[PDB]
Design an enzyme around this catalytic site. Structure first.
Site, PDB file in Angstrom:
ATOM      1  N   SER A 214       0.786  -1.263   0.000  1.00  0.00           N
ATOM      2  CA  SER A 214       0.000   0.000   0.000  1.00  0.00           C
ATOM      3  C   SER A 214       0.797   1.280   0.000  1.00  0.00           C
ATOM      4  O   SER A 214       1.609   1.492  -0.875  1.00  0.00           O
ATOM      5  CB  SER A 214      -0.953   0.043   1.210  1.00  0.00           C
ATOM      6  OG  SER A 214      -2.309   0.350   0.935  1.00  0.00           O
ATOM      7  N   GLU A 347      -8.454  -7.019  -5.016  1.00  0.00           N
ATOM      8  CA  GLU A 347      -8.016  -5.876  -4.183  1.00  0.00           C
ATOM      9  C   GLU A 347      -9.162  -5.065  -3.605  1.00  0.00           C
ATOM     10  O   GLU A 347      -9.189  -4.751  -2.401  1.00  0.00           O
ATOM     11  CB  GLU A 347      -7.131  -4.916  -4.986  1.00  0.00           C
ATOM     12  CG  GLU A 347      -5.765  -5.437  -5.416  1.00  0.00           C
ATOM     13  CD  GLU A 347      -4.695  -5.263  -4.373  1.00  0.00           C
ATOM     14  OE1 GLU A 347      -3.574  -5.781  -4.574  1.00  0.00           O
ATOM     15  OE2 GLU A 347      -4.969  -4.613  -3.341  1.00  0.00           O
ATOM     16  N   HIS A 467      -7.165  -6.473  -0.750  1.00  0.00           N
ATOM     17  CA  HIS A 467      -6.010  -5.653  -0.366  1.00  0.00           C
ATOM     18  C   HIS A 467      -5.614  -5.958   1.080  1.00  0.00           C
ATOM     19  O   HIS A 467      -6.490  -6.020   1.948  1.00  0.00           O
ATOM     20  CB  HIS A 467      -6.376  -4.159  -0.543  1.00  0.00           C
ATOM     21  CG  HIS A 467      -5.225  -3.214  -0.427  1.00  0.00           C
ATOM     22  ND1 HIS A 467      -4.180  -3.194  -1.330  1.00  0.00           N
ATOM     23  CD2 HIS A 467      -4.974  -2.217   0.460  1.00  0.00           C
ATOM     24  CE1 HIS A 467      -3.333  -2.235  -0.994  1.00  0.00           C
ATOM     25  NE2 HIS A 467      -3.790  -1.627   0.092  1.00  0.00           N
TER      26      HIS A 467
END
Ligand code: 7ND
Length: 566
Positions: A214, A347, A467
Site C-alpha cells: 500500500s 483488491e 487488499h
C-alpha cells in the site's frame, strides 16, 4: 466499529501483553551502532523458533518542538548502552479500532531482527515500510511480527516514519522550511542508517531489499525514484501500490490553513501565521481533525488523504520529490535494480466497509465519470468526452443493467492498483536499463488465519483475496495462531517468505527449493510483451497470463486521443 471489537481487541491486546513476555528469553545482547551500543533481547515464536530483537533504535532526533513538520535530523549519540528490549510508540494517528488518537510525536525508530547475530556469511537485508494510507500504521510486532521471516537466514528491519499532517504538512513559503514529505525524508534517513549499520547485525550492506504494501509500496517506489537514496539498496518489491498511483501523491499546500482553521486558528491565510499556530497545537488535536480537511469536491475526485507525498514547492538539501512522480521515473536510479510488483486477486474488496457506510457510492458506476483519471476528466465531469471515457470503464466492470456492490469493488481494483501498475510498467520500459521486473498475483484465500485489517474491511466472512490479505502470510500479528505444518496456510507462509527471501538474495524470485514451484518458469515482463504474465499464488503456484489484462487494456483506451498523457 463495534463495542464488541473495541473490547476483545483490548483483551487480545491483553493476550498480546502476556505472550510477549512469555515468548521472551532472559538472554540479552549488545550490538554496535555508529551512534553507540544498543541492547537487544532474544525472543521465541509460537513455532519454537528464536531471534534476536532490537527495537526502538532511533535513526533521527525526536521531531518535537521546533523540529515538528521539519525534515529529520541526525540523532544525538550516547555513551553507555541504549536499552532496545521494548518497543517505542507509533506515530500519532487515529486508532482504526477505538477511534481515539494514540501514539506519540516521538516515533522515529526502527527495529532490527535476525536469528543469528553472528552468521558465517553477510546476510540479505530486508527493509519493510508499512502502509496505512500515510495516516496509520506501526512497526509493533502485534501487527508486524518478524516471526515468519526469521525462519530464514536474513536480517529484517521494520521502520516507522511520521504520518498524517505531522509527516506531510507542506507550505509554499521558502522562509519556513516546511516544504513537505517529512515522512518520506524519515524513510531516507532510516535507509541511510540501515546501509551504515546493518553489518553490525550480520547483514550485507551490499545486498539490501526494500519492500512495502500500500502506502508502503508507494513509499518503497518513492525510495527508488528519489536521488537522495541512489545505490542504497539493490532490490525493490512493490506490494499493491506504487508512486504513480493517483492516490499516492497530492498537492496539499493549501490544506494547512484549513487544518489550522479546524483547530481554531484566528487570523488571515498566511503560511508563517498558520505554521506558528500548528506548531503549538496539541498533536492529538491536529490528527483527529485531519479527517475533516478534505473538501466535498476533493472526496468526490478520490483524494485519499489530506496530507501525503507531494511535489515540494522549492528544493532544499533534503528534498525527496522535486517533480511529479511520473517525471521522476524518467531518470530514476531504481529503474535499474531488480523489481517485483504484484496485487491480490480481488483488491477492491478492501472497500467493503467504506461502501457499507456510503451506499450511494455504487451509483457512481451509472456513468463511471468519477473514476476517469483526473488528468483526462473535466472539472464537473460533465463533458461528453468524459462521459465517453467513463463508458469505457463502465463496459469493463458493470455486469448488469444496474451496477452492484461487487462491480464497484472490481472497478476499485483497477482504479487504485492494476491500472497504475500497467502505466508504471510501460513508463518504466521507456526509461530503463533493461533490468528485470517480475509480477506476482496473490490469490490465496483463507478464513482460518487472518490479520487485523480484515476487520477494517469488515471482511470477517467474505470470499476473495482483498487488499492487505497477503500480509497474514508475511508477518505475525496478535490475531495469528500456530498453524499445523501441513496446513494450506502454513505452506503459504513458507512459500511467501521463501520467494521474498529468494528474490532479496538473488534478484530472481524463482527457486526450485520452494514447494509447488517445480513446473514454474517465472520470466520477467518484456517491453515487447502484449500480455503480462504473473506467478499466480494460490493453493498451487502457476504461471498465468494476468487475468486483469483485458480490463487493463480497456482502461488504457481512455487515452486513445491523449497518448502523451498515458
Ligand atoms: B494502503 O493501506 O496505504 C491503502 C489504504 C486505504 O485506506 C482507505 C483510505 C480511504 C478510504 C478508505 C480506505 C486506501 C488505499 Br487506495 C490504500
Amino acid at each position: 466499529v463495534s463495542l464488541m471489537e473495541k473490547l476483545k481487541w483490548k483483551i487480545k491486546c491483553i493476550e498480546n501483553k502476556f505472550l510477549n513476555y512469555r515468548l521472551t528469553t532472559n538472554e540479552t545482547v549488545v550490538a554496535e551502532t555508529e551512534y553507540g551500543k544498543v541492547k537487544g533481547v532474544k525472543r521465541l515464536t509460537v513455532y519454537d523458533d528464536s531471534y534476536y530483537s532490537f527495537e526502538g533504535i532511533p535513526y533521527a532526533q525526536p521531531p518535537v518542538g521546533e523540529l515538528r513538520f521539519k525534515a529529520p535530523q541526525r540523532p544525538t549519540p550516547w555513551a553507555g548502552v541504549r536499552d532496545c528490549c521494548n518497543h517505542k510508540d507509533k506515530s500519532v494517528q487515529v486508532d482504526f479500532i477505538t477511534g481515539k488518537v494514540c501514539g506519540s510525536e516521538d516515533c522515529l525508530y526502527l527495529s532490527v531482527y535476525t536469528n543469528n547475530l553472528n552468521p558465517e556469511t553477510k546476510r540479505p537485508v530486508l527493509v519493510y515500510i508499512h502502509g496505512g494510507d500515510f495516516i496509520i500504521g506501526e512497526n509493533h510486532r502485534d501487527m508486524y511480527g518478524p516471526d515468519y521471516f526469521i525462519k530464514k537466514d536474513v536480517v529484517l528491519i521494520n521502520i516507522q516514519y511520521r504520518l498524517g499532517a505531522l509527516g506531510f504538512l507542506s507550505l509554499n513559503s521558502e522562509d519556513l522550511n516546511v516544504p513537505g514529505n517529512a515522512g518520506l525524508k524519515d524513510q531516507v534517513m532510516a535507509l541511510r542508517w540501515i546501509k551504515n549499520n546493518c553489518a553490525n547485525f550480520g547483514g550485507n550492506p551490499d545486498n539490501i531489499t526494500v519492500f512495502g504494501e500500500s502506502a508502503g509500496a508507494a513509499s518503497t517506489h518513492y525510495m527508488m525514484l528519489t536521488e537522495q537514496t541512489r545505490g542504497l539498496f539493490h532490490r525493490g518489491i512493490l506490494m499493491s501500490g506504487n508512486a504513480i498511483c493517483p492516490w499516492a501523491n497530492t498537492q496539499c499546500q493549501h490544506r494547512a490553513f484549513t487544518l489550522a482553521k479546524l483547530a481554531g486558528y484566528k487570523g488571515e491565510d498566511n503560511d508563517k501565521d498558520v505554521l506558528e499556530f500548528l506548531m503549538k497545537a496539541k498533536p492529538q488535536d491536529l490528527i483527529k481533525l485531519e479527517e475533516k480537511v478534505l473538501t466535498l469536491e476533493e472526496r468526490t475526485n478520490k483524494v485519499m488523504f489530506p496530507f501525503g507525498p507531494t511535489v515540494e514547492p522549492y528544493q532544499t538539501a533534503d528534498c525527496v520529490l522535486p517533480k511529479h512522480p511520473r517525471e521522476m521515473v524518467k531518470t530514476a536510479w531504481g529503474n535499474s535494480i531488480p523489481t517485483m510488483m504484484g496485487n491480490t486477486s480481488y483488491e477492491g474488496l478492501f472497500f467493503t466497509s467504506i461502501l457499507k457506510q456510503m451506499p450511494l457510492l455504487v451509483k457512481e458506476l451509472e456513468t463511471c465519470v468519477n473514476f476517469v483519471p483526473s488528468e483526462l476528466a473535466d472539472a464537473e465531469r460533465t463533458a461528453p468526452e468524459t462521459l465517453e471515457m467513463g463508458a469505457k470503464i463502465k463496459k469493463a466492470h458493470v455486469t448488469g443493467e444496474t451496477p452492484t456492490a461487487d462491480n464497484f469493488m472490481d472497478l476499485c481494483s483497477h482504479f487504485y492498483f492494476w491500472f497504475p501498475m500497467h502505466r508504471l510498467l510501460q513508463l518504466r520500459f521507456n526509461h530503463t536499463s533493461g533490468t528485470p521486473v517480475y509480477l506476482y498475483r496473490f490469490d490465496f484465500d483463507s478464513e482460518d488465519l487472518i490479520n487485523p485489517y480484515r476487520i477494517m474491511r469488515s471482511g470477517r466472512g467474505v470470499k476473495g483475496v482483498s487488499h492487505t490479505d497477503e500480509l497474514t502470510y508475511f508477518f505475525w500479528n496478535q490475531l495469528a495462531k500456530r498453524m499445523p505444518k501441513e496446513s494450506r496456510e502454513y505452506k503459504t507462509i513458507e512459500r511467501m517468505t521463501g520467494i521474498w527471501t529468494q528474490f532479496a538474495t538473488t534478484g530472481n524470485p524463482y527457486s526450485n527449493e520452494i514447494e509447488g514451484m517445480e513446473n514454474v518458469s517465472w520470466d520477467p515482463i518484456e517491453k515487447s510483451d502484449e500480455v503480462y504474465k504473473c506467478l499466480n499464488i494460490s493453493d498451487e503456484l502457476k504461471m498465468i497470463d494476468v487475468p486483469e489484462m483485458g480490463k487493463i487494456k480497456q482502461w488504457e483506451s481512455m487515452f486513445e486521443k491523449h497518448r502523451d498523457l498515458f
